Structure 1
Amino acid sequence: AMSGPAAYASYVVRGANLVTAVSYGRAMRNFEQFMARIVDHPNALPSVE
């Protein structure tokens, strides 16, 4: 017996990646984390937890 997930994780190109996917021809996994670290906390050192 084991207990894992039941479904796939869903990744989809939503409203901010979809502009750079169309216009630049490059997209990114999870835009919201890249934006919330470059401009929101620019001096946050990479910690583990």
Structure 2
Amino acid sequence: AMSGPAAYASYVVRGANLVTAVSYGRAMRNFEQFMARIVDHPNALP
């Protein structure tokens, strides 16, 4: 026995709303969580 998907894999459009109000405080909070992943999980990266 084995398992798979029910139907063919459909595409999703990403990049419509770019939201351009990106702040400095949220970018540093995203950068600290991103650099911690290289030490934590090098293969699983968001």
Question: Could you state the TM-score of these two structures normalised by the residue count of structure 1?
Answer: 0.23
Distance 2:38 2:8 in 1: 29
Question: Which has the larger displacement, 28-37 or 9-18?
Answer: 9-18
Give 1 or 2 for the bigger CA radius of gyration: 2
Deviation at 1:44, TM superposition (A): 1.0
TM-score (norm 2): 0.24
Q: Percent identity?
A: 100
Q: Which runs of no fewer than 5 residues in structure 2 stay unpaired? A: none
What residue number does 1:22 align with? 22
Two-structure CA RMSD over aligned residues (Å): 9.5
The answer for the alignment partner of 2:35 in structure 1 is 35
More strand by share: 2
How many equivalent residue pairs?
A: 46
Structure holding more helix per residue: 2
Write out the 4+ residue segments of structure 1 that deviate beyond 4 Å after TM superposition: 1-29
